[PDB]
Paper text:
Most bacteria proliferate through binary fission, which occurs by the ingrowth of the cell membrane and the peptidoglycan (PG) cell wall to form a septum at midcell. FtsW belongs to the shape, elongation, division, and sporulation (SEDS) family, which functions in cognate pairs with type B penicillin-binding protein (bPBP) family transpeptidases for PG synthesis. The septal PG synthesis is a key step in cell division. As PG synthesis is the primary antibiotic target, Fts complex holds significant antimicrobial potential.
However, the mechanism by which FtsWI is activated is not fully understood. Here, we determined a cryo-EM structure of FtsWI bound to the regulatory proteins FtsQLB at 3.3 Å and performed mutagenic studies to reveal the molecular details for understanding the mechanism of divisome activation. The FtsWIQLB complex from Pseudomonas aeruginosa was expressed, purified, and visualized by a cryo-electron microscope (cryo-EM). The high-resolution cryo-EM map allowed unambiguous assignments for the FtsWIQLB complex, except for FtsQ, of which only the C-terminal β ectodomain (FtsQβ) was resolved. FtsB and FtsL form a long α-helical coiled-coil at the center of the structure, with its N-terminus associated with the transmembrane (TM) α-helical bundle of FtsW, and its C-terminus extending into the periplasmic space, where it interacts with FtsQ and FtsI through their ectodomains. FtsI contains an N-terminal single TM segment (FtsITM) that interacts with FtsW in the TM region and a ‘trophy-like’ C-terminal structure composed of a transpeptidase (TP) domain and a pedestal domain (FtsITP-pedestal), interacting with the FtsBL coiled coil in the periplasm. FtsW comprises ten TM α-helices (TM1–TM10) and a large extracellular loop. TM9 inserts into the central pocket with an angle, together with TM4, TM6, and TM10 forming an outward-open cavity. In our structure, the h2 loop of FtsW is stabilized by FtsL. Moreover, this stabilized h2 loop also positions the putative catalytic residue D275 to interact with conserved residues in the central cavity of FtsW. The binding of the regulatory complex FtsQLB induces the allosteric changes in both FtsW and FtsI to facilitate their activation, including stabilizing the ECL4 loop of FtsW and positioning FtsITP to the site of PG synthesis.
Author numbering:
A (entry chain C): 4 to 96
B (entry chain E): 172 to 270
C (entry chain A): 1 to 224, 237 to 382
D (entry chain B): 6 to 38, 52 to 490, 502 to 559
E (entry chain D): 6 to 92
């Protein structure tokens, strides 16, 4: 009876569709990668918060062992330290 | 073996104390003292002992500028009468203690 | 082996260039690309658990897509007279493949059915080759009816010499969805094939009775709290909204749908692309099915009746499969075990769907130029 | 549909297909149009002094986690858990019953990790435990008012922890988990937004200076038997606060039954009349505009002036005539009142406003109040006698210290700041440099001369300052700056009524000034100038 | 011809927008990689600082070197002989 014909921009439409497919696949994999990186960053931040909790515990433990009153008393009574007088200290420049 | 400066410090900081020794030697050669030993408590304090018997004590943190302040103080005020000096303390925000 | 192909003339290698049916090809290519995208998005997490490669199922589906396009080209080379004269051999090979599937020695076991063959890297599901061979044989029988004895009682049961054993053996391993799709294609083909209304009603009622009789004593293997998935899949449609949450940003696929890339692809699609995306996909499926029916109408106009009945059978295969799968994802029907024609991950399903698309384009070309 | 041999059958089939598709569409769009988000708490920022010493750390504590739906399945275990938890069985039962519908409630907050885990292990009626963060203040009582406490929710409630609540309390994150009807987390899957940890905050306080000031103020309060006290130390150049103490100070971590006065910041809510300590500003304004020579003689005799119902009386009236230096040395009031009479009080108000008296402080502390500096289009004799004199002008300790620091900075009013300032702000030149230098030398002389202020001399540093007393009951005030040729630290000392000491500033606050500022300058490495 | 060109162009532009910018883009992938690197560096610094503080506490439990260093640094005191040099 008759014959059909593909649209003139068949190759252009095929290239556009291939680009659309590649963009959609890239979007899906990018979203998956972003979620994986979010999980990894959560793990890193959990490690950081664990380290900071340990540091806070160590600071609390050091606080009883380090204070101005206790340090001064140990320096004077035990280490025989002395505060230099303004005339005694030789200052440079 | 004994002529070389002995290196002391924590087991896993043995590489770091070597670089610190290199830096201290580089910044201390013009002053005339020769490094004989360098010890590090894991706290981070740096102990320096020279061949002439005088010792330098450096605390943790700010070593890079504490040593420069030591250079300045020695080379413009303390460059004379080093014989009686046997103990040097740098553990001050800016000052220096001589003994 | 290539003597059966006819590269000259053909819808691609015609003297006038390439002259296939663009609307059907565009619809099916849109469906294929949407299926690849949805398979990637839904199967990222699913493939991450099994193998270290997140793109396991996506790369496999892309390979199956390339193989399907090649198969569509090969089929569009193949003339319809070869299908007409090969129908019996195709039926026999479908019988053989299905029986070999039933055998436990070569068939691989799944959670609730055994409807695949290993074949190493790539799996083969003869439950779809059986559907296509049934369609071709049924078209051949329909054209033979108009030439043999009128309303012969021996020819009344002739479809059930093949339709009933195939339905029973496809029910043998649990594949009720594929059996229902195949029977729907056969019954609707006959309804459109000129079978008398009383005769067609008798055929359909006896077929339903035979199937409900054969549904018993058919466990998964013989000799030679699951509602949470559907409940949380129904939530996907509601939470997707009129505009979806975008590709890859799906949520239910990460917890409640281990089959998000095989069976519940439509739920993931309607959640990621929204209700507008689900309606667009439904419209695409309806347009492709009605186009595959109008191709048969046109082949019927040109007095090429075998092509008309083959196109009816393929259109009804697609109609049954997509209707049942969507109505199950949306919750209307309980028949879990079915996959969408193009969007689902199924390997041999995609190759067979592309072969059916090639066959329909060949019908469209042949109804015009010889 | 006309081409088919049976158009009716094709029409029926297409209609049936469209009806099924319409049913699907209706169930999709006309009918349709678990997993829960749990926040990820953010680590609170660390507060540290200007050198690096921590002032507020986020130490961890183990907090018992309670899910009432699980306790209603192990009600028989309620007495056993209540025995270890230290509460009555009836109290536990009624609390759970009141929290029946809730998904998550707290049992205890600050239990130590080594025993909370033991409690949750010995008894297991579906109870959980989490290791949350709570604020600890290693400096403690010394910086209690500058670094305020946080509530049990770990958010700012007072002091710099609520002033800088946004800066310290980082943005919490969110994540998705599989929580069933009972509430147990089956799995953790995805974090939709990571928690942003808090940013470390560095203060301007010198913890050595703060320790020294707190110790000296505590000694002042104990030996002098005063009710309260305050002491603010500032760096004139950068305009920041180097120290702030209020001897009634509390303990910011052991807050069990603390009186308010113990938690009151007596440096920014406690307002007072500066009295004689504001005279240098008034006389500096007189010098700037009235062309009043510092060596000019003012007839202070007889030391008592009557202005209507208001009378001005001097502490000493033996001196018939006194110069400006004599006026400040003798703390004369009639002379400065007459000087203000001879000048414009509008300039007086402008000079007092531009240095920050009673207008506002850039600190923005929660527990903060501003002073009152009266303003009028016309200034009667009584109004200027109560305005140029600190006898109706109200200022805080921080405002007086900031004004004295600006006066010590050659008239450069540097904005107030508690955060460690790294570069010197330009500020504004409220006072001309020569007038500021003259006033600085005069405040040097007044504490150097043989007048009423001699105890304020810093040993080794030729300090400067002025002593004044309020009457609303006396309040002893002394503000000044120690280095003469190049001021580096300016500070104020405020203490309430001394029970067993004189209320004069030069007797009860000058020794405190000298004692704390000697060490303050020693640790600041400023060369001596005496 | 056909409107398919318009549809494909619009869809491609939208998907490239969602791929290169916004949430879930490659830009966010690079961000999160940078954040991972920065947080790992911070973690190494924190885990060294915690060890140093732990050793300091342990020496505090038995020694006087830390007390001497803190007295020299904060309090500004000095042992016998003095001769403090300042600048």
């Amino acid at each position: 009876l008759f014959v059909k014909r593909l649209p003139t921009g068949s190759f252009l439409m095929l290239l556009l569709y291939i680009g659309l497919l590649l963009s959609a696949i890239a979007v899906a994999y990018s979203t998956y990668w972003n979620r994986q990186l979010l999980n990894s960053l959560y793990s890193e931040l959990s490690v950081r918060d664990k380290a900071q909790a340990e540091w806070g515990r160590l600071i609390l433990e050091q606080s009883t062992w380090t204070a101005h009153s206790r340090i001064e008393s140990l320096a004077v009574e035990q280490l025989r330290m002395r505060v230099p007088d303004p005339a005694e200290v030789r200052m440079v420049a | 073996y004994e002529h070389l400066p002995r290196l002391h410090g924590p087991q896993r900081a043995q590489q770091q104390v070597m670089q610190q020794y290199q830096l201290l030697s580089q910044l201390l050669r013009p002053l005339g003292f020769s490094i004989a030993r360098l010890e590090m408590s894991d706290r981070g304090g740096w102990a320096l002992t020279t061949a002439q018997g005088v010792e330098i004590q450096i605390g943790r943190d700010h070593v890079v500028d504490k040593i420069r302040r030591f250079v300045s103080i020695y080379d413009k005020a303390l460059k004379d009468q080093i014989s009686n000096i046997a103990r040097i303390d740098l553990r001050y925000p800016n000052g220096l203690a001589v003994a | 082996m290539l003597s059966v192909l006819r590269p000259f003339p053909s819808p691609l290698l015609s003297r006038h260039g390439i002259d296939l049916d663009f609307p059907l090809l565009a619809g099916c290519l849109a469906l294929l690309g949407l299926g690849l995208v949805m398979v990637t998005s839904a199967s990222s997490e699913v493939a991450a658990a099994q193998s270290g490669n997140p793109l396991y199922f996506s790369v496999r589906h892309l390979i199956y897509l390339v193989i399907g396009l090649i198969s569509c080209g090969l089929t569009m080379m193949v003339p319809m007279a070869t299908w007409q004269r090969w129908g019996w051999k195709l039926l026999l090979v479908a019988f053989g493949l299905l029986v070999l599937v039933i055998t436990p020695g070569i068939g691989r076991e799944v959670n609730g059915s055994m409807r695949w063959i290993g074949f190493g890297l790539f799996n083969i599901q003869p439950s779809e080759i059986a559907k296509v061979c049934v369609v071709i044989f049924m078209a051949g029988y329909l054209i033979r009816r108009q030439q043999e004895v009128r309303e012969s009682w021996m020819g009344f049961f002739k479809p059930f010499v093949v339709l009933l054993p195939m339905a029973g053996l496809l029910l043998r391993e649990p594949d009720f969805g594929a059996t229902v799709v195949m029977m729907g294609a056969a019954a609707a083909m006959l309804f459109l094939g000129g079978v008398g209304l009383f005769r067609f009603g008798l055929m359909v009622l006896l077929a339903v009775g035979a199937v409900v009789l054969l549904i018993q004593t058919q466990p998964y293997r013989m000799a030679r709290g699951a509602g949470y998935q559907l409940s949380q899949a129904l939530i996907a449609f509601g939470r997707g909204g009129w505009l979806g949450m975008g590709l890859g940003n799906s949520i239910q696929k990460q917890f409640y749908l281990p089959e998000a890339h095989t069976d519940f692809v439509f739920a993931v699609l309607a959640e990621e692309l929204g209700i507008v995306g689900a309606l667009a996909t439904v419209a695409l499926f309806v347009f492709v099915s009605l186009r595959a029916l109008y191709i048969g109408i046109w082949a019927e106009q040109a007095k090429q009746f075998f092509s008309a009945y083959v196109a009816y059978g393929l259109a009804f295969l697609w109609i049954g499969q997509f209707l049942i799968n969507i109505g199950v994802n949306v919750g209307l029907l309980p028949t879990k075990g079915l996959t969408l024609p193009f969007l689902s991950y199924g390997g041999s399903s995609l190759v067979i769907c592309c072969a059916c698309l090639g066959m329909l384009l060949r019908i469209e070309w042949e109804r015009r130029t010889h | 549909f006309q081409g088919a041999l049976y158009p009716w059958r094709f029409c029926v089939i297409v209609g049936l297909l469209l009806a099924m598709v319409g049913a699907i569409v209706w169930r999709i769009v006309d009918l349709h149009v678990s997993v829960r988000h749990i926040a990820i708490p953010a680590h609170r920022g660390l507060i540290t002094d200007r050198n690096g010493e921590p002032l507020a750390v986020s130490t961890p504590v183990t907090t018992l986690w309670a899910n009432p739906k699980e306790l209603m399945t192990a009600k028989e275990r309620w007495p056993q858990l209540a025995a270890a938890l230290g509460q009555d069985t009836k109290l536990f039962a009624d609390r759970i019953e009141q929290n029946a519908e809730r998904e998550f409630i707290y049992l205890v907050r600050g239990l130590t990790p080594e025993q909370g885990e033991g409690v949750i292990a010995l008894k297991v009626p579906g109870v959980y435990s989490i290791e949350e963060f709570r604020r600890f203040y290693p400096a403690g009582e010394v910086v209690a008012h500058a670094v305020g406490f946080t509530d049990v929710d770990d958010r700012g409630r007072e002091g710099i922890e609520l002033a800088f609540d946004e800066w310290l309390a980082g943005v919490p994150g969110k994540r998705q988990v599989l929580k069933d009807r009972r509430g147990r987390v089956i799995k953790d899957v995805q974090v939709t937004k990571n928690a942003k940890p808090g940013k470390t905050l560095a203060l301007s306080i010198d913890l050595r200076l703060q320790y020294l000031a707190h110790r000296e103020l505590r000694n002042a309060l104990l030996e002098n038997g005063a009710k309260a006290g305050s002491l603010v130390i500032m760096d004139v150049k950068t305009g920041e606060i180097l120290a702030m103490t209020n001897q009634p100070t509390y303990n910011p971590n052991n807050r069990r039954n603390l009186q308010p006065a113990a938690m009151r910041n007596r440096a920014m809510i406690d307002v007072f009349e500066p009295g004689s300590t504001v005279k240098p500003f008034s006389m500096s304004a007189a010098l700037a505009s009235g062309r009043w020579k510092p060596s000019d003689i003012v007839d202070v005799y007889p030391g008592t002036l009557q202005i209507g119902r208001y009378t001005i009386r001097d502490v000493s009236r033996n001196s018939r005539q006194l110069d400006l230096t004599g006026i400040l040395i003798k703390s004369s009031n009639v002379g400065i009142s007459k000087i203000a009479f001879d000048i414009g009080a509008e300039s007086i108000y402008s000079v007092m406003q531009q240095v920050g008296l009673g207008q506002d402080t850039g600190l923005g502390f929660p527990g903060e109040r501003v002073g009152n500096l009266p303003n009028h289009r016309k200034w009667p004799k009584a109004e200027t006698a109560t305005l140029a004199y600190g006898y109706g002008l109200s200022v805080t300790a921080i405002q007086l210290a900031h004004a004295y620091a600006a006066l010590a900075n050659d008239g450069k009013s540097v904005p107030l700041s508690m955060t460690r300032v790294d570069r010197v702000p330009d500020g504004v030149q409220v006072i001309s440099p020569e007038v500021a230098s003259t006033v600085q030398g005069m405040l040097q002389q007044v504490v150097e001369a043989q007048g009423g202020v001699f105890r304020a001399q810093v040993p080794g540093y030729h300090a400067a300052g002025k002593s004044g007393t309020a009457r609303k009951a006396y309040r002893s005030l002394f503000a000044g700056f120690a280095p003469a040729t190049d001021p580096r630290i300016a500070m104020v000392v405020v203490i309430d009524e001394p029970s067993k000491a004189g209320y004069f500033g030069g007797l009860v606050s000058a020794p405190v000034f000298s004692k704390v500022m000697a060490g303050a300058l020693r640790l600041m490495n400023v060369p001596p100038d005496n | 011809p056909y409107w398919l060109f318009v549809v494909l162009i619009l869809a491609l532009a939208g998907l490239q927008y969602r791929l290169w910018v916004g949430d879930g883009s490659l830009a966010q992938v690079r961000d999160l990689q940078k954040q991972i690197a920065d947080q790992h560096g911070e973690n190494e610094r924190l885990l060294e600082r915690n060890r140093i503080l732990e050793a300091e506490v342990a020496e505090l439990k038995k020694g006087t070197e830390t007390v001497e260093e803190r007295a020299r640094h904060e309090l500004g005191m000095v042992k016998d002989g003095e001769t403090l040099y300042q600048l």
